[PDB]
């Protein structure tokens, strides 16, 4: 699925991301835009043996198990294929675990580089 920004905002809000650990909803929508272009099926297969999965481009070394990545920790306790679902719940729950495991949103390079310090509310502006 490729989400619209307002539809993704509403789905993320239903799952408690607005103000999760002090990150407003627009931050999460912005991260998804620049990680995956709102595409639940996105993958980026890296040269280091790992792969980034789904709408939030969660990596298979620390966070999910794809079976094929050296150094697997599987800290979200999920197969990486669960992060390619059309519904966002597994990606949201794993994103919350990423923050809960010592990280800010700085764990996402696209967030740091394209959302941090910007008008993130533009991504929810005008949404019902
Ligand atoms: Cl829900
Ligand atoms: Cl729901
Ligand atoms: Pt789809
Ligand atoms: Pt949902
Ligand atoms: Pt939901
Ligand atoms: Pt939820
Ligand atoms: Pt949830
Ligand atoms: Pt749900």
Residue numbers in the entry: 1 to 128
From the paper:
Structural Dynamics article is a comparison of identically prepared crystals' diffraction data measured at three different temperatures, and carboplatin binding in the triclinic crystal form at one temperature, we have also revisited 4mwm, 4mwn, and 4oxe to again (i) remove any clashing solute molecules and (ii) replace the potentially confusing use of the incorrect “CPT. We have removed solute molecules which we are not certain as to their chemical identities. Table I shows that the clash scores are now much improved.
It includes the refined platinum atoms at the His15 ND and NE sites assigned as before according to their anomalous difference electron density peaks, which Shabalin et al. (2015) concur with. The respective platinum atoms' refined occupancies and ADPs are as in 4mwk, which were derived from SHELX least squares model refinements, as described in our article. In 4mwk, we had imported the PDB's “CPT” ligand and then deleted ligand atoms that did not fit the electron density. We realise that this was due to the PDB's CPT having an incorrect, tetrahedral, rather than square planar, geometry.
